[PDB]
Design a protein around this motif. Structure first.
Motif, PDB file in Angstrom:
ATOM      1  N   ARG F  42      48.754  37.848  35.933  1.00  0.00           N
ATOM      2  CA  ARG F  42      48.405  36.805  36.879  1.00  0.00           C
ATOM      3  C   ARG F  42      46.938  36.428  36.968  1.00  0.00           C
ATOM      4  N   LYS F  43      46.162  36.858  35.984  1.00  0.00           N
ATOM      5  CA  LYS F  43      44.747  36.542  35.957  1.00  0.00           C
ATOM      6  C   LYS F  43      44.190  36.513  37.380  1.00  0.00           C
ATOM      7  N   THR F  44      44.367  37.609  38.119  1.00  0.00           N
ATOM      8  CA  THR F  44      43.881  37.691  39.500  1.00  0.00           C
ATOM      9  C   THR F  44      42.366  37.844  39.565  1.00  0.00           C
ATOM     10  N   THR F  45      41.756  38.060  38.405  1.00  0.00           N
ATOM     11  CA  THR F  45      40.313  38.213  38.306  1.00  0.00           C
ATOM     12  C   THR F  45      39.844  37.553  37.016  1.00  0.00           C
ATOM     13  N   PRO F  46      38.557  37.179  36.943  1.00  0.00           N
ATOM     14  CA  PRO F  46      37.977  36.527  35.767  1.00  0.00           C
ATOM     15  C   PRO F  46      38.102  37.379  34.526  1.00  0.00           C
ATOM     16  N   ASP F  47      38.317  38.669  34.734  1.00  0.00           N
ATOM     17  CA  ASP F  47      38.443  39.599  33.630  1.00  0.00           C
ATOM     18  C   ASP F  47      39.884  40.083  33.539  1.00  0.00           C
ATOM     19  N   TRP F  48      40.794  39.197  33.136  1.00  0.00           N
ATOM     20  CA  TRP F  48      42.198  39.578  33.043  1.00  0.00           C
ATOM     21  C   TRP F  48      42.718  39.970  31.674  1.00  0.00           C
ATOM     22  N   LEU F  49      41.832  40.270  30.733  1.00  0.00           N
ATOM     23  CA  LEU F  49      42.309  40.664  29.414  1.00  0.00           C
ATOM     24  C   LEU F  49      41.246  41.210  28.473  1.00  0.00           C
ATOM     25  N   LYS F  50      41.134  42.528  28.399  1.00  0.00           N
ATOM     26  CA  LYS F  50      40.162  43.162  27.511  1.00  0.00           C
ATOM     27  C   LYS F  50      40.987  43.639  26.321  1.00  0.00           C
ATOM     28  N   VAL F  51      40.389  43.762  25.141  1.00  0.00           N
ATOM     29  CA  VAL F  51      41.199  44.206  24.017  1.00  0.00           C
ATOM     30  C   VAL F  51      40.596  45.155  23.001  1.00  0.00           C
TER      31      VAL F  51
END
Ligand SMILES: [Mg+2]
Ligand SMILES: [Mg+2]
Ligand SMILES: [Mg+2]
Ligand SMILES: [Mg+2]
Ligand SMILES: [Mg+2]
Ligand SMILES: [Mg+2]
Ligand SMILES: [Mg+2]
Ligand SMILES: [Mg+2]
Ligand SMILES: [Mg+2]
Ligand SMILES: [Mg+2]
Ligand SMILES: [Mg+2]
Ligand SMILES: [Mg+2]
Ligand SMILES: [Mg+2]
Ligand SMILES: [Mg+2]
Ligand SMILES: [Mg+2]
Ligand SMILES: [Mg+2]
Ligand SMILES: [Mg+2]
Ligand SMILES: [Mg+2]
Ligand SMILES: [Mg+2]
Ligand SMILES: [Mg+2]
Ligand SMILES: [Mg+2]
Ligand SMILES: [Mg+2]
Ligand SMILES: [Mg+2]
Ligand SMILES: [Mg+2]
Ligand SMILES: [Mg+2]
Ligand SMILES: [Mg+2]
Ligand SMILES: [Mg+2]
Ligand SMILES: [Mg+2]
Ligand SMILES: [Mg+2]
Ligand SMILES: [Mg+2]
Ligand SMILES: [Mg+2]
Ligand SMILES: [Mg+2]
Ligand SMILES: [Mg+2]
Ligand SMILES: [Mg+2]
Ligand SMILES: [Mg+2]
Ligand SMILES: [Mg+2]
Ligand SMILES: [Zn+2]
Lengths: 138, 104, 124, 99, 208, 83
Positions: F42-51
């Motif tokens: 839900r991209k609840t924060t600007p950082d919703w996906l680190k990889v």
RNA sequence: CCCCAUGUGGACCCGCCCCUUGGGGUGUGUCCAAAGGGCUUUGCCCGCUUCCGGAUGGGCCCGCGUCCCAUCAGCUAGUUGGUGGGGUAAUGGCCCACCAAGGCGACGACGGGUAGCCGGUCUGAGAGGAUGGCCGGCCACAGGGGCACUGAGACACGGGCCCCACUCCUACGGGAGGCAGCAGUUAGGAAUCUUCCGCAAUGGGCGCAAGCCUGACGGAGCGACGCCGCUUGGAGGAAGAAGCCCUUCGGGGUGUAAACUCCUGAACCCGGGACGAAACCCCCGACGAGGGGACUGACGGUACCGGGGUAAUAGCGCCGGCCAACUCCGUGCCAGCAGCCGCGGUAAUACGGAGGGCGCGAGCGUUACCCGGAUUCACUGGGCGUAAAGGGCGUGUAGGCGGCCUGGGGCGUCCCAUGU
């Protein structure tokens, strides 16, 4: 036999001071002399000196006390209020440099025996080492 | 590291096998004093080399038999029954303390 | 004891003994009444304590106190036991839960009703 | 009822039979050979050995013997044979035997 | 549900004035005026030397009834103020004063702490824009606590923000009586509060 | 077979996955071999996906087979962009 | 499914080299491969065979740690070791033939009892004590006992065989079953839920794909079972209504509480209405990188947003001391209370009610159990003249402990780095 030479010495000292002896002899041993060195430096005893009793080596320990007091019982306050053996045969006690106790909130000491020699808790902590916890004085 | 141990050969009564009595020390988990326990290992002695009284180094090995996972790595110091004695004398007290009682 | 002794024999941990073999150690046990007698107190006290022999589902046959001003227990009435002795009645180790099973609650109980299992009276 | 994958059991039985059959042939030939070497008859001892060797490796082809199971069989077949052949043998065919 | 019941009776039991009504608690009627003795059939009888418990008990009850908070919530704040670094005593008071519902009261929007509780509850309050109806909401330093636009016209809010003209504000706060805004500058310190409380005993009471 | 997939770690209605390298056979929320990223649906924060694309490429380097959704997130962090 | 061939290679015997338990290389001999299918069909896709390597998962071995009772003291014959052999992926008495006569034990063998173990959890100043449910790791089991087959892998919960018990069908010969999967029934119990929705999301099995299956899972349902949040209103309002309680009959209390006035406005109504979904797939492009495009939600019309809008649940324990909270009446060692000390036999703050009060509040209180207080099993941190506690005395085994000086070693002990 004399089961614990070190404990024998702390006691001779505890015993003599309680009756206010000026001096007090204890059979000499390199190690015991090492301990007395600290006792003096930390200011617990006027000092000590090698001596020969009946031909055998001893260490005179010059006791130190506070001044005379007021009211009943003018007996001087002891400089050595305490002095208890810790590591003892059949119950040796060793500590890491992180486990070196803080005696009497710092007003008292603790004599350790490290591979760097006999030092006080502060000295040991400095040199960052641990070892058999000989005794506690304050 | 295949564990290496040192003990004494308290028994040479078997074929190609010996009983090494490895001693051990350590601080009691609650009372701290250094206590000293000991265990017997059956080690493989092919050459039938090692004799009763020898101090040897045992080495963790691949099973050789049931109850036998050590091989005599090497000899540290020959002859010295002063140790075998303790072990035997202790076995001797057992020969009692049951319905009779162990000597002295 | 010397340190070496402590190492040999060591300290023995204390074992508490139950005071309520309501078995299963359960919180409650239900039984059937057998005798709705009335015992007399001990040492000083005097009165007619209402008691009841009970045949538990735990296989035990016990004596239980019946708290409250007045009860309605009979010969074969089903009841619930809660554990709790009575200082004056030697032999009574459990109380009977009022308001459960056949034990009706106390009538006209306007206070500590939680105990004595009586519903909230509707203030006219 | 009916978990049509009974078929599995259905097939297990076949495979069981197929395997069982390979192995018995194997054992028979193995002795057959060992017993010939036994009696000292060189030639035909190896000739048969080679068949044994073959059947074994083929048994390991599919999932009958499979693995080192095959390897064990082969090895524990050339030793016994060459030794028993020490009775004035002289491995003629020298089949499964690097002379 | 936080208490809700006669309140000037608590004022009396603590034998000390409690501003659980904002106004009136001034007009010779807080009852602590010519009747500062505890409520009930015994209020006028002589009081006996309280037990150490009684004292610690009464002290906590005070500090707590001041913020009309439940023991349940009160206790958790305390155990929170006990773990965090710094003199538990004051740290505790800091957290008590950081309740959105308290702040509102502190900023003059509401006359009492109860009233403020409702204003927050009934949505009439804001926190950096987004409205917040959680009285237990913890206000941080650097938060604007404005009155809801839709409510800025509310009779109640206009009176209080009016009389609020001139009235100074805590040194850890500040307010723009114009847009009916205000800011939580910093966590108040024990000195900033003139609380008739001795947290010393409150800490000791939770020590038992 | 070793995979690169998501692991439910959120909470009710507040899902938060953990791009993980586990064995195909484990519980989805079981013990993984390594963590290599995370994903906030839900991209609840600007950082919703680190990889941590470095590691991924390593796992793929040896049989790691990504779930579809896992691959789609790995692509987003350009694990495949070979420019 | 099989035979022959091809031998990249690999397996076995023997020799040799390097290595060092069965690791790697090498020479001769022997031995061992394969499957096809699909299309946008002369190429690409799916797939097959042999070998080496990685990755993942696993078997086996070892050091150390792992409850109670010694009113369990001796245990042991495949038992301990050996040689040859079987079996396995593999070591091994794992199994077998023969040989030896060993192996284990008070540092507690053997036996009896209890118990899945751990990360953790509860408590505690800590040391420690208790615990191992939810979640994750390992093990074990799948009505009880035994057994193997097929397989990479099982001795295989929803696979097989035999014996046992039980249930069901039986034309009495013989058959069929195993909810410790989800839900549900019944029994037992103080006690523990919906025969629910969905495959949309995450994950898993098969499939090239479309997609199929998934009581795993994602959700909703019930239950104050726990935690957290929230409401039952806010402000004003008498030197103070009535009722009820107490009184020295003057008065005091319930109490700003109420009534009443004004303000806000949970419920509830109306409208809008979500994230969680982007892939797989299509198109371009090499089925790649990259770009664009389409489909899909159980929860759910729920969360949330906007408008309208009513002052709208409070209870439970306690008030003799420990322990915060006191008066009247009734009762009369009764009826009853009781955790301990105790209270009631005509003035009871201890029983029952009432008024008042204290605590806590959608909870409150009880019962059960664990830790605490208990330094009351004491390592931290206790004792043994008379309180419980020195063995009737000695000799001495094991064991525990060990004067002064020097040198070697560095096992304990201390330090650093590193891995876990
Ligand atoms: Mg045959
Ligand atoms: Mg405490
Ligand atoms: Mg061929
Ligand atoms: Mg073709
Ligand atoms: Mg590997
Ligand atoms: Mg063998
Ligand atoms: Mg069990
Ligand atoms: Mg303690
Ligand atoms: Mg702690
Ligand atoms: Mg702990
Ligand atoms: Mg533990
Ligand atoms: Mg369970
Ligand atoms: Mg069953
Ligand atoms: Mg097989
Ligand atoms: Mg089943
Ligand atoms: Mg029942
Ligand atoms: Mg699905
Ligand atoms: Mg899927
Ligand atoms: Mg009011
Ligand atoms: Mg789909
Ligand atoms: Mg009191
Ligand atoms: Mg009562
Ligand atoms: Mg009376
Ligand atoms: Mg009472
Ligand atoms: Mg009463
Ligand atoms: Mg204790
Ligand atoms: Mg004592
Ligand atoms: Mg006595
Ligand atoms: Mg005596
Ligand atoms: Mg005696
Ligand atoms: Mg005697
Ligand atoms: Mg001796
Ligand atoms: Mg010495
Ligand atoms: Mg010694
Ligand atoms: Mg030396
Ligand atoms: Mg060392
Ligand atoms: Zn007031």
């Amino acid at each position: 036999m004399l089961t614990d030479p070190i404990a024998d010495m702390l006691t001779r000292i505890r015993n003599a001071t309680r009756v206010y002896k000026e001096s007090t002899d204890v059979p000499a041993s390199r190690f015991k002399e090492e301990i007395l060195r600290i006792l003096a430096r930390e200011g617990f005893i006027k000092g000590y000196e090698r001596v020969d009793v009946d031909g055998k080596p001893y260490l005179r320990v010059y006791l130190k006390y506070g001044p005379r007091r007021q009211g009943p019982d003018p007996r001087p306050e002891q400089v050595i209020h305490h002095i208890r053996r810790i590591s003892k045969p059949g119950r040796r006690v060793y500590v890491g440099v992180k486990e070196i106790p803080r005696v009497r909130r710092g007003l008292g000491i603790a004599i350790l025996s490290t591979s760097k020699g006999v030092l006080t808790d502060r000295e040991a902590r400095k040199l960052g080492v641990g070892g058999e916890l000989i005794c506690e004085v304050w | 590291p295949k564990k290496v141990l040192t003990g004494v050969v308290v028994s040479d009564k078997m074929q190609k096998t010996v009983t090494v009595l490895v001693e051990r020390q350590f601080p009691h988990p609650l009372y701290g004093k250094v206590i000293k326990r000991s265990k017997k290992y059956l080690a493989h002695d092919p050459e039938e080399k090692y004799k009763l009284g020898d101090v040897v180094e045992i080495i963790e090995s691949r099973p050789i038999s049931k109850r036998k996972r050590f091989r005599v790595l090497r000899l540290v110091e020959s002859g010295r029954m002063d140790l075998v004695e303790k072990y035997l004398i202790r076995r001797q007290n057992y020969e009692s303390l049951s319905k009779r009682g162990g000597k002295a | 004891p010397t340190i070496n002794q402590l190492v040999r024999k060591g300290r023995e941990k204390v074992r508490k003994k139950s005071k309520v073999p309501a078995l299963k150690g359960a919180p409650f046990r239900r039984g059937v009444c057998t005798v709705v007698r009335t015992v007399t107190p001990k040492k000083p006290n005097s009165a007619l304590r209402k008691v009841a022999k009970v045949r538990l589902t735990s296989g035990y046959e016990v004596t239980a106190y019946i708290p409250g001003e007045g009860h309605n227990l009979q010969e074969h009435s089903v009841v619930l036991i809660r554990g709790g002795r009575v200082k004056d009645l030697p032999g009574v180790r459990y109380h009977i839960v009022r308001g459960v099973y056949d034990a009706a609650g106390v009538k006209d109980r306007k206070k500590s009703r939680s105990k004595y299992g009586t519903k909230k009276p509707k203030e006219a | 009822r009916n978990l049509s994958a009974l078929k599995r059991h259905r097939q297990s039985l076949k495979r069981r039979l197929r395997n069982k059959a390979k192995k018995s042939a194997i054992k028979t030939l193995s002795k057959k050979a060992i017993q010939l070497a036994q009696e000292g008859k060189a030639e035909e001892a190896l000739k048969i050995m080679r068949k044994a060797e073959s059947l074994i490796d083929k048994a390991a082809k599919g999932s009958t013997l499979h693995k080192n199971a095959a390897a064990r069989r082969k090895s524990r077949l050339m030793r016994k044979v060459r030794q028993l052949l020490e009775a004035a043998g002289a491995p003629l065919i020298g089949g499964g035997l690097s002379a | 549900g936080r208490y809700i019941g006669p309140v000037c009776r608590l004022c009396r039991r603590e034998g000390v004035k409690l501003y659980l009504k904002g106004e009136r608690c001034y007009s010779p009627k807080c009852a602590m005026e010519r009747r500062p003795y505890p409520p009930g059939q015994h209020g006028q009888k002589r009081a006996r030397r309280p037990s150490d418990y009684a004292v610690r008990l009464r002290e906590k009850q005070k500090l707590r009834r001041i913020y009309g908070i439940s023991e349940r919530q009160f206790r958790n704040l305390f155990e929170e103020a006990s773990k965090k670094k710094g003199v538990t005593g004051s740290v505790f008071l800091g957290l008590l004063e950081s309740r959105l519902d308290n702040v509102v009261y502190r900023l003059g929007f509401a006359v009492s702490r109860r009233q403020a509780r409702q204003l927050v509850r009934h949505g009439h309050i804001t926190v950096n824009g987004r409205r917040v109806d959680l009285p237990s909401y913890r206000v941080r330093p650097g938060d604007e606590i404005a009155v809801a636009e839709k409510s800025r016209n509310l009779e109640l809010i206009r009176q209080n923000l009016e009389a609020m003209k001139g009235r100074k504000v805590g040194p850890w706060l500040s307010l723009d009586v114009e847009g009916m805004k205000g800011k939580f500058l910093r966590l108040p310190d024990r000195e900033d509060l003139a609380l008739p409380v001795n947290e010393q005993l409150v800490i000791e009471f939770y020590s038992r | 077979m070793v995979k690169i997939r998501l692991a439910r770690f959120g909470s009710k209605h507040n899902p938060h996955y953990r791009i993980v390298v586990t064995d195909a056979r484990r519980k989805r929320d079981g013990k993984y071999i390594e963590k290599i990223g995370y994903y906030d649906p839900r991209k609840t924060t600007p950082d919703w996906l680190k990889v941590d694309v470095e590691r991924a490429r390593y796992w793929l380097s040896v049989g790691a087979q990504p779930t579809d959704t896992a691959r789609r997130l790995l692509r987003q962090a350009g694990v495949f962009r070979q420019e």
